[PDB]
């Protein structure tokens, strides 16, 4: 069903060591297609996927112009945040921004996003209705009243329902092989004795796309969210993802435990039990 | 495709 496009941008002020560093990356679902690094030699929006390289010359000149303008504005926004929080300009701070759009199976606009965080905390977020803002703190209330007075939401909504979705539809047709695919997880169990009395069962999911996945543990059909360990979903480095979950288990009790895997690429959710 | 205008906090 749903496809998404996201831009993630980080501004980091380094007072002394020059102007703030700005990094932006674009994703369609869990595939990167571009990057900009203010500190790099090129000074350009760069391709980061083989399928995006067939975008014409004007694409690259326009996206470069627009990401350098984004650079300037988020540079100014760090200085405004200093005022609002009455912080010294000796300190290093992080402004993070995430925006983009979703389309359904039918190719219709589903969802828009436009969110900021200031040194790792929610600052302001465009609501799901795309008509109003969520301010997480007292500084963000100032921004919110400014933005409601200037009709910033109405203007962003036109971008999100316009150029954002138009971009996403085009990428989905030009990167079809990579983006409109599911790779099901290859699953298995490992068993690691850790004592006379204790053992670790590890449930594995390798080589799946997209990255969205659920690994859950049960003990005789009861949810085991206890002595349980879930690693972050990690890239394989080749367009696919990996994950494991583990439970530490009294010796002899292995057969009572089940790993349950959900992924779009599986017809039915798997159950796995230790029995090699 | 990026927007052509970003808001100031």
């Amino acid at each position, epitope marked *: 069903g749903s496809h998404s496009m996201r831009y993630f941008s980080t501004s980091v002020s380094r007072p002394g060591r020059g102007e703030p560093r700005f990094i932006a990356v674009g994703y369609v679902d869990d595939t990167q297609f571009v990057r900009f690094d203010s500190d790099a030699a090129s000074q350009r929006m760069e391709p980061r996927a083989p399928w995006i390289e067939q975008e014409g010359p004007e694409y690259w000149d326009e996206e470069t112009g627009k990401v350098k303008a984004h650079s300037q504005t988020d540079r*100014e926004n760090l200085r405004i945040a200093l005022r609002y929080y009455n912080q010294s300009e000796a300190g290093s701070h992080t402004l993070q921004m995430m925006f983009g759009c979703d389309v359904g199976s039918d190719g219709r606009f589903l969802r828009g996003y436009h969110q900021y965080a200031y040194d790792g905390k929610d600052y302001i977020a465009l609501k799901e209705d795309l008509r109003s803002w969520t301010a997480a703190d007292m500084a963000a209330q100032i921004t919110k009243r400014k933005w409601e007075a200037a009709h910033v939401a109405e203007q962003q909504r036109a971008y999100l329902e316009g*150029t954002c979705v138009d971009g996403l539809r085009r990428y989905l047709e030009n990167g079809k092989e990579t983006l409109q695919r599911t790779d099901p997880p290859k699953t298995h169990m490992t068993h690691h004795p850790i004592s006379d009395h204790e053992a670790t069962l590890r449930c594995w999911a390798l080589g799946f796309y997209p990255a969205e996945i659920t690994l859950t543990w049960q003990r005789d059909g009861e949810d085991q969210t206890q002595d349980t360990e879930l690693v972050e979903t990690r890239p394989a480095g080749d367009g696919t993802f990996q994950k494991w979950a583990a439970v530490v288990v009294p010796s002899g009790e292995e057969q009572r435990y089940t790993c349950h895997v959900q992924h779009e690429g599986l017809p039915k959710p798997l159950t796995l039990r230790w029995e090699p | 495709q990026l927007p052509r*205008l970003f808001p100031l906090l």
Partner: T-cell receptor
Amino acid sequence: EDVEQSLFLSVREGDSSVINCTYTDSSSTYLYWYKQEPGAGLQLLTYIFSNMDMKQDQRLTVLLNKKDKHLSLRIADTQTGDSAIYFCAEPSGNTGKLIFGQGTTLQVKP
Amino acid sequence: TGVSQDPRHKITKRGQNVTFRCDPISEHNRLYWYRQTLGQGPEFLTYFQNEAQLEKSRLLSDRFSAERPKGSFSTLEIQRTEQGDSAMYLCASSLHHEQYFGPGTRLTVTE
């Protein structure tokens, strides 16, 4: 590549005046009508966002066709006081700086 | 009626310097200068995002120089004026996208 509108439109008092305007970029998320009287400065008259078909305010109607880049201003029951120069404006590049049509002088005839 | 421009009208001898002032609506972060000749649409001169001048046109030659030292007010200076410089010099400000224009500075350059 320019914002094109006609230089001159004559209309009879009480009739509806339509002012047409073709703009440059489909990626433009808003389009403005400014009005200029003989003496005074640019008045921001009305606007529309690229995801609306039509907007209404008193006698003013704005129609947008994003596909063809066609914007139009409809004045209902045109009065002699509606005589002025009407400029359509579109954002250009990444600063929100405006490019302007040459402007339509609306002559209302008693 | 929030954007102020000074002076409203100016006459200078060709070859002299002139300075205009624009006071934007109180808290407006974005400020734009445009030139307008009678008959015609305003033409962009330059753009300020707070203190930073991020864009100038090719219309803005060596002789033209804008500053916005503290954000707040902006000034456009023309050096060694020619008769082609005679025009309305407009200022606009916005919070985001909506641009409010002042009444302009009507410059006349005479021999």
